[PDB]
Nucleic acid binder design. Structure first.
Ligand SMILES: CC(C)n1c(C(=O)N(C)C)c2c(c(O)c1=O)C(=O)N(Cc1ccc(F)c(Cl)c1)CC2
Ligand SMILES: CC(C)n1c(C(=O)N(C)C)c2c(c(O)c1=O)C(=O)N(Cc1ccc(F)c(Cl)c1)CC2
Ligand SMILES: [Mg+2]
Ligand SMILES: [Mg+2]
Ligand SMILES: [Mg+2]
Ligand SMILES: [Mg+2]
Ligand SMILES: [N+]
Ligand SMILES: [N+]
Ligand SMILES: [Zn+2]
Ligand SMILES: [Zn+2]
Lengths: 368, 184, 368, 184
DNA sequence: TGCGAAATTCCATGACA
DNA sequence: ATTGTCATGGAATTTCGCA
DNA sequence: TGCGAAATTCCATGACA
DNA sequence: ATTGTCATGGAATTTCGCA
């Protein structure tokens, strides 16, 4: 501070202050003649305060803070002190956006069998139709085969009623859902245990995780829309038609309809495929097994040129879910306990709770 | 001649009246001819209307080429014929008083009655809730003739609920004395 | 139809039906043995009906429609007839999404002078502060210099009151705004004409068009948020501070604060730049003029590998603005009258009105 | 010694009382020393409070190093001194009864009074609405001494509202007879 | 053993609000 | 304790029909 | 006339709801 | 009759201090 700057004035060399510039005194302060002009060299004991005053004017990041400081001062390695501060500004850390994108999405393996995994989700509220406002959508993971049930609410009770009817047909090993009130209730957990079904939940606020059913919602809404063009939106009576229509629609990449993957043969619907007419059922199911295993499976896309991947013990911040007007979009920093996979992590949140969280709902805390 | 397949023929029939359960009285029974797969729908009446309402659920999953039935009123009505025609389903009737199905089907229908009877005793009024499990049972029941269960023939896979316990299906002596007492 | 198929059965060659396959009769219908199997060749007079029945099952696109048809039929150039139909399905055309992105954004030239162009916009509603709920934000195009005014509504009357106060300082040639109720009212048009100010409007529902002010809203909300961390959102009293803070914040790419571009010299604020201390004002303004013209200007980015650009007389569809639940997201097709620039067009909308519209709010009608 | 610059010195002063306009009675007048740029703020009183309220608007645009004023009550109060100190503005007072500004400023302040007087006659009650145009005028008025208008010196550009009509600024004989009548 | 055209496959785009 | 998906329609590539 | 480190410039990312 | 923008903080590149 005052010691360092003294040795300097009397012409000695101090590590960090380049020798070729003349360091004088004037108005009671140590100055220096840099190419840009004459800047005050404050004593180290003042530097934190200066960086902070600069930063606080508009809570600026690295360069915009430096440029304020540089107007009056110079010292060795200014940006280091600037960055030190940015890393300690609570307000900056919880308010700024990220500028690093998530690593490339995983493409989970397709469930191996029909009924291995259900994905379920609600659609709505829709325009009242027969007193119904929602649709329970159940999509078999492997086949894409889909069941639709109209409901009056996205409630556990309505979920349970619908799934009793569905599971008359078969019982799935696993049901995957998002964290909607309906699926996370203890009543629903019971209902599942009662049947030996494992409940599997998406990381919260990350519907891509229910992507199988979500994507089917799109088709359901799309077809419903087309069928209701120029008519009043009376959808309740179309659910069955829509279901049947979708279950029997070809996926151009697979070359199969979900019905075909589920049953290995078309039922009595229009344009039924006849290719296995001469095979015995047993020859048919044998061929179905081979078709099921040989389906196209997409791969993880290339990482964007500026992505981040979670590392154990990294400081990261979880996105606030429903941030109020003029309130920070991020929670305070927290630590990566476990890296479940490159896109899913467990974090200890300073409260501290364990939360299993999508990397998409995280940013890495800046400036370490 | 081409080999038998699922969805070639649904055999439908009613069972009832039964004691009131959640306001229901009958069961429409659908059995796929080839697979022996069974679907059950509770109705309030053996009417064309309740049949159409129920078959609309099933036929929104899979459509049979042929429905076979006896000459029940509900199945011989012209409404039901119109319904079937819309969906391009051929209707097929056994001659009156002489019901013919198939061996596989007859046996299936037998199991259904007996299995019902067994569970409706003790709780003659709670059957509505049990229809799902009654079906799972029926469908994961091993066929003596074919090496497979209906589930297996339908879906081409093992089921996640096998019924390794091939059951008594007969009335235990406790139940015969409280079945001759219930209907008294 | 029946003529064509006759000549064929009796072994003659018809253009389009390849010679090397045997075309027979069976069950009263013309059949053919193709590698895939035996398919019915319907008479041309039946083909439109068949394509339509297939398509209508789930209103499927090209391949998914073809695969249904191929199950039972074959004829020459099936997809041509399929595409013909897709192009005529009202419901498909107004309900499906686009799969072609907009051409690359324009980067308009920076206004040459302060006061050449204002961009204005409202922010809010915010949490009530002193009975105020909105903020009028006025951003000078060239400098980025910004004025803020709290309002009780995004109303013309409040716009006028604020701008009378602002235009005490100078009068702008042009004021650019979006199509908010406040800016499109005739009262506001009058107020502008009265002062010789030209009103310039964004194509509707395309805020990127007000990008200069929009982007400033972000900074305004961001700083307000930070300043209100852990306090009740009492923003009214901070507007002045925020204004001053932002107007004096460096843009790292320009190396100037908006204040500097506006005045060519810092006022008495913290960290004022002193570099022009020895220049006369006139030397200063001379240097300001040179700084103003030499500012970095970004260029139009590369086109995405699957973009479209509007062409005069093309069939295009405008996105529905506030589409109701289960209703189409697109209006019926309409024609490009004029290509104002590669990102802005005039269309005749079948009503038919002239609408000036952003290419972002259009898709090109599929299948011509 | 360094050349004179905008924001080096604001000269502030009140003008009033005037007739009620939208409930306002005074005008706080701020003139930038170097440029001669003028800002006008209507107040309801020549108080420290109304001064602070008004200067808070201006100083949220640009902050003077020095405010010069006479020894008006509002400017000599310790509240006003506290206010200035917060913003690091030095306060500067002309000795009582002997107001010194600068030539440029004195002339400016003269134009302001005369220009006001001219427009408040005929409409002594509509002046509030005219303050914006009064300022545009003052600021796009060519300086005899410097080759430029205040706008030009402030912003370094021509203005979009030049006032090529250098006006009479004097009371026409119609107005002297209805100004000696208005205040009667 | 190579051509022109049809068929099939590729794959960016966008929406599950 | 978990994880994107896939219809869509122009363009790119392969296959087909013929020689 | 070349090194290591600091400084500056680059630029994808995301939000103006 | 009109049209995206730019703070941000790691990484990439250039400049600086010294020799
Ligand atoms: C009710 C909660 C748990 N929930 C929520 C929710 O978080 N909120 C706040 C409504 C959503 C959805 C739910 O299904 C859902 O149950 C939902 O589908 N999308 C649409 C969407 C958006 C982007 C995508 F990539 C995908 Cl696949 C789907 C919005 C949010
Ligand atoms: C009131 C209308 C005309 N309006 C609307 C509007 O169209 N609706 C329906 C609210 C919007 C905005 C207005 O300012 C505005 O005035 C507005 O800023 N954004 C935020 C946004 C989103 C993406 C971007 F790229 C940019 Cl630049 C800004 C949302 C829509
Ligand atoms: Mg969803
Ligand atoms: Mg019967
Ligand atoms: Mg906006
Ligand atoms: Mg005075
Ligand atoms: N997996
Ligand atoms: N331009
Ligand atoms: Zn900060
Ligand atoms: Zn269609």
């Amino acid at each position: 501070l005052d010691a360092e700057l003294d040795q300097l004035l009397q012409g000695h060399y101090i590590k960090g202050y380049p020798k070729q510039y003349t360091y004088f005194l004037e108005d009671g302060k140590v100055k220096v003649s840099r190419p840009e002009g004459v800047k005050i060299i404050p004593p180290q004991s003042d530097r934190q305060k200066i960086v902070l005053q600069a930063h606080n004017l508009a809570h600026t990041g690295r360069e915009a803070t430096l440029l304020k400081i540089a107007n009056l001062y110079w010292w060795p390695n200014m940006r280091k002190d600037v960055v030190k501060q940015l890393g300690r500004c609570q307000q900056c850390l919880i308010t700024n956006a990220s500028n690093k994108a998530s690593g490339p999405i995983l493409r989970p393996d397709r469930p191996q069998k029909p009924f291995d995994k259900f994905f379920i989700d609600y659609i709505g509220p829709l325009p009242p139709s027969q007193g119904y406002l929602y649709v329970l959508v159940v999509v078999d993971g492997m086949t894409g085969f889909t069941w639709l049930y109209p409901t009056k609410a996205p409630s556990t009770s309505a979920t349970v009623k619908s799934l009793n009817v569905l599971t008359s047909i078969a019982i799935p090993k696993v049901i995957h859902s998002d964290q909607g009130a309906a699926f996370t209730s203890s009543t629903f957990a019971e209902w599942a245990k009662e049947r030996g079904i494992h409940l599997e939940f998406s990381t919260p606020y990350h519907p891509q995780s229910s992507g199988k059913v979500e994507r089917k919602n799109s088709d359901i809404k799309r077809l419903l829309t087309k069928l209701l063009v120029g008519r009043p939106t009376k959808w309740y009576d179309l659910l069955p038609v829509v279901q049947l229509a979708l279950n029997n629609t070809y996926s151009p990449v697979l070359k199969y309809t979900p019905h075909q993957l589920l049953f290995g043969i078309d039922s009595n619907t229009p344009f039924a495929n006849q290719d296995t007419l001469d095979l015995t059922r047993e020859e048919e199911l044998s061929l179905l097994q081979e078709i099921r295993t040989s389906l196209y499976h997409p791969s993880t896309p290339p990482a964007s040129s500026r992505s981040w991947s979670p590392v154990v013990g990294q400081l990261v911040q979880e996105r606030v879910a429903r941030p109020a007007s003029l309130r920070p979009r991020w929670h305070k920093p927290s630590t990566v306990l476990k890296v479940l996979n490159p896109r899913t992590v467990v974090i200890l949140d300073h409260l501290g709770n364990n939360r299993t969280v999508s990397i998409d709902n995280l940013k890495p805390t800046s400036h370490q | 001649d081409r080999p038998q397949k699922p969805f070639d023929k649904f055999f439908i029939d009613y069972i009832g009246p039964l004691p009131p359960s959640q306001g229901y009285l009958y069961v429409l029974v659908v059995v796929d001819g080839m697979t022996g797969f069974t679907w059950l729908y509770p109705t309030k009446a053996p009417s064309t209307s309740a049949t159409v309402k129920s078959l609309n659920v099933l036929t929104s999953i899979a459509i049979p080429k042929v429905i076979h039935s006896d000459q029940g009123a509900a199945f011989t009505s012209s409404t039901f014929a119109e319904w079937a025609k819309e969906r391009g389903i051929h209707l097929e009737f056994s001659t009156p008083y002489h019901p013919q199905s198939s061996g596989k089907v007859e046996r299936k229908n037998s199991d259904i009655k007996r299995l019902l009877t067994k569970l409706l005793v003790g709780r003659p009024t709670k059957w509505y809730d049990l229809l799902p499990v009654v079906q799972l049972a029926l469908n994961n029941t091993y066929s003596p003739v074919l090496k497979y269960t209906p589930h297996q023939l339908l879906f081409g896979i093992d089921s996640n609920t096998p019924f390794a316990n091939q059951d008594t299906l007969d009335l235990t002596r406790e139940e015969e004395l409280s079945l001759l007492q219930e209907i008294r």
